[PDB]
């Protein structure tokens, strides 16, 4: 009922994007536990983000079931890098990822609005759009502090941020 | 130390296979919560399996870090089906998946043995090989009961199994 | 005192028979946990019976010591089958076993009576004869329900009995 | 999977040997509660060993089921003696029994290694090989103390050992 | 009802025998607290036996009342010795006493059986015959340990038995 | 049983090496509590490592006893330095020590494998090989952070590491 | 301040002697857990002594740091024997060791007195001299009881001492 085929397909694309985001954060988490990086609170922070993205994907999969759509899964692409370079660079990449996921969600909302699907609009507003705003804000805060502190080249910056903000 | 490049690569392949298994089980979980399947304990059972496979993948990623190897992630391929057909068919597919993952782990163990890597052999024996045996046994039990009960065509079989064994 | 050599020997034969019964039930327990049988409550039920028969044997061994007799152990023969065929067939075999053990106990009681051994008669009446009656009754109940339900050929019967009576 | 027929048969032989060990210890337990031996802590010690051997047998029976093998039970032979002669002699016989069971387990491990069965090797290493080493050590300790104390001919030795080490 | 005069008289004889046994054990208890014996746990052990025999006598007196018989008390004869010689000798005398009391109870049971008095037979089987078997076994155990330890001439034997088995 | 003389000797050499490692860490602990070093959490960290190495030595001494080998102790050589120079240098020396101890353990495992001693192989895999991997990883993490922070010449680096990672 | 170079060197010699004493007691502890000695409370007693000597060494190392001295470690020599012969012989060797350590401490006190170092004198009096007196007294008590009991040749003596004084 009131579930447009374009919306079903767009939900499936968003599911894949959320799973991709989860994979990016998983990669980041295990980069920070390398013996040549060893920033354990950066690691835990990104692991927590990874698990949150899996929950984001699952809520959309539940939505598809609830609305009578058909979940169509696609390959989860590997992240763009295996070496994330530094705490600052990972934070900057996460910030860009969240902005890109946000743009996809806003396009999905525009599609739902065009199709007159208020249930889908409310779902996105309730569980996704403000979560994205908060995440983009948090990551921007972290990027700003790391830059001001002199990361990645100032030897104390990422260590101090790991042990005081993320710990 | 004592970490052969062939082993590093084989660990990365096993990481990908564990993530694939997690994805298969996630797909199965959300198949069973469709409005035309609606077997909620099959759904929860496979969701729990999915989360266990993610843990399997993470332990190998930790092993790579601990040994000084480099994690190299690859695309997580989508599962072979989106429509898993029945509770019995999903159980049979899970059984085959676990046997295939087991064969990969036994090949990894043979490689570790050939390279004289007792730490890697013990890691596989401690966390993987018996887990696989138990999982293959459990799934075989479930397949047998579903077949004997008359699944998928006997209308009460999958429902009764959902509500008594998996619930 | 008042302990006839025929009674000493008959007690030793009964010890062996109780140990045999324990072995039969152990075999049954592990038949029901095969991956092609997988009736876990049948398995637990027969395992509990096995442990009870070991206790039956030990009480007779204690009796021999208390009365000044000499325990003389013999081989414990393997059970008649390794494949118990079905839940119904195992229950029917257990019923026959308990009737046979009961007949042996009643012959032992008749011998004790003939030898004027009231301590031995009371021992059998107190710990064995009513236990056997209760066990034969319980197994007869189980056989009747399984037969009426359509076991072994009705696919739901043994499963439902496992999950509702024995569970 | 990866379960060699020679291994299936060797597991069945080991099951029988563990059940035999349990029977030997049961015989010993009830020897020590004779009115002409009356060493109640020797009795309890060997009864506890008997129950441990039954658990050893059951774990192998479970392994057979888990791996898809077929349990094939054989007669449990009676112990070599019904009169165990003394506390020292029983301890010496138990020590020899455990060494013989250990040799059988090491042959089983060598077979599993030859067949490339790391799951079976790990199973034996995890639950059997160190248990055997500890048991052989404990029994050797007990034999040494009993010999030094003058057992069986020094009238106080077995009594004092019963009441201070085993009690 | 169904209470034969021969049984009434035999119950009265058994009452007297139980009271005699209580007196023997009282004498033994106070022998072991002499300043030239001073085995306080032998003393407590026999005092406990004395009190148990008084209970045995009282239960028969209650039986007489319950059945409508007439209690006819007789002198309680003094024990055969006032000097019980040693811990071993007292244990051996207690063993003989319990065997003699057992023979009297078995004769009483035979009389009750001949008179068709199942209530009296059951009373003896329930409260007397197995108690006697257990007591004869316990005393035989104690005699055996004391003999093997070298009592009464080995200076440490009775002391060690007092402080470890009876204490 | 199955305990090769070469293995007995190699175990004794490993005992000595573990005791040496304990001594190195004890020296390091008391270097960091000098009035001209005064890094109390470096001190506590290395003291904890010292106590862990003593436990490593004791477990091998117990193994020798359990297997019937003869412990043969040798002088514990003093550490290579009394002045450990800096927090970074001590961490780098500890890392090299643990790699050297690891290589000795892997040689011991290879010897045990060659001699067909699965109990010894499992002992090393269970209690030593993964402990070494974890320790080498931890020390590598610490070295990396100290280097990146600018230790030993950056005046705040070792102090901050002491007070945030090791405290 | 007021810390003479002769005192610094003598403290370093005493550190080494305390570590040697700890090693002697460690050797003794593991002698008593051999399968041909098996005196578990002798073993625990000497293990506790070993740990106490390590604490004695550490307190002197702390003293060196507190006073601004330089700890200079030396090899810890192996104990004089690996086979300690008997419980009595080990106790006699421990008694001689403690007397020798006491003489070294009294020489250290005489040196501190000659150098006008009341802090060092008080340190020795507070933590070492009375501890040594108590230890020499305790070991003398143990030697006396073992000798009087007939150790090592009286088969019950060391066993009884293990189970009553040290247990
Ligand atoms: Cl908000
Ligand atoms: Cl921030
Ligand atoms: Cl900086
Ligand atoms: Cl298991
Ligand atoms: Cl099942
Ligand atoms: Cl149906
Ligand atoms: Cl009833
Ligand atoms: Cl029923
Ligand atoms: Cl049916
Ligand atoms: Cl152990
Ligand atoms: Cl012992
Ligand atoms: Cl003796
Ligand atoms: Cl009883
Ligand atoms: Cl006794
Ligand atoms: Cl004596
Ligand atoms: Cl780990
Ligand atoms: Cl770190
Ligand atoms: Cl700085
Ligand atoms: Cl004092
Ligand atoms: Cl003492
Ligand atoms: Cl002696
Ligand atoms: Fe998201
Ligand atoms: Fe996000
Ligand atoms: Fe897995
Ligand atoms: Fe799996
Ligand atoms: Fe029975
Ligand atoms: Fe039965
Ligand atoms: Fe066993
Ligand atoms: Fe055993
Ligand atoms: Fe009585
Ligand atoms: Fe009595
Ligand atoms: Fe170590
Ligand atoms: Fe280490
Ligand atoms: Fe000391
Ligand atoms: Fe000392
Ligand atoms: Mg960190
Ligand atoms: Mg690609
Ligand atoms: Mg709106
Ligand atoms: Mg809203
Ligand atoms: Mg977020
Ligand atoms: Mg349902
Ligand atoms: Mg594809
Ligand atoms: Mg292992
Ligand atoms: Mg699993
Ligand atoms: Mg079931
Ligand atoms: Mg046969
Ligand atoms: Mg029964
Ligand atoms: Mg006893
Ligand atoms: Mg035979
Ligand atoms: Mg054992
Ligand atoms: Mg006394
Ligand atoms: Mg008279
Ligand atoms: Mg009694
Ligand atoms: Mg500090
Ligand atoms: Mg040197
Ligand atoms: Mg191995
Ligand atoms: Mg470590
Ligand atoms: Mg002992
Ligand atoms: Mg030397
Ligand atoms: Mg002391």
Author numbering:
A (entry chain A), B (entry chain A), C (entry chain A), D (entry chain A), E (entry chain A), F (entry chain A), ...: 10 to 176
Provide the authors' own sentences about this structure as they appear in the paper.
Ferritins play a crucial role in iron homeostasis and detoxification in organisms from all kingdoms of life. They are composed of 24 α-helical subunits arranged around an interior cavity where an iron-containing mineral core can be reversibly stored. The ferroxidase center (FoC), an intrasubunit di-iron site, catalyzes the oxidation of two Fe2+ ions coupled to the two-electron reduction of either molecular oxygen or peroxide. Mitochondrial ferritins are atypical of those found in higher eukaryotes in that they are homopolymers in which all subunits contain both a ferroxidase center and a presumed but undefined core nucleation site.
Crystals of a H57A/E61A/E64A triple variant of FtMt, designed to eliminate the iron-oxo cluster binding site, also showed no evidence of either unmodeled density or anomalous scattering in the vicinity of the Fe5 site. Other than the side chains of the substituted residues, the structures derived from crystals of the variant protein were identical to those from equivalently treated crystals of wild-type FtMt, the structures overlaying with overall RMSD for main chain atoms of 0.110 Å (150 residues). Data for the triple variant showed that deletion of the H57/E61/E64 inner surface sites severely impacts the ability of the protein to form a mineral core. An indication of the individual contributions of the three residues was provided by data for the single variants. These demonstrated that E61 is the critical residue for core nucleation, with substitution of this residue alone having an almost identical impact to substitution of all three potentially coordinating residues. Substitution of the neutral H57 had a negligible effect on the rate of the FoC reaction, while that of substitution of E61 was greater than E64 and appeared to be cumulative in variant H57A/E61A/E64A. However, variants E61A and H57A/E61A/E64A were both inhibited to the same extent. Therefore, of the 3 residues acting as ligands to the observed iron-oxo cluster, E61 is critical to release of Fe3+ from the FoC of FtMt.
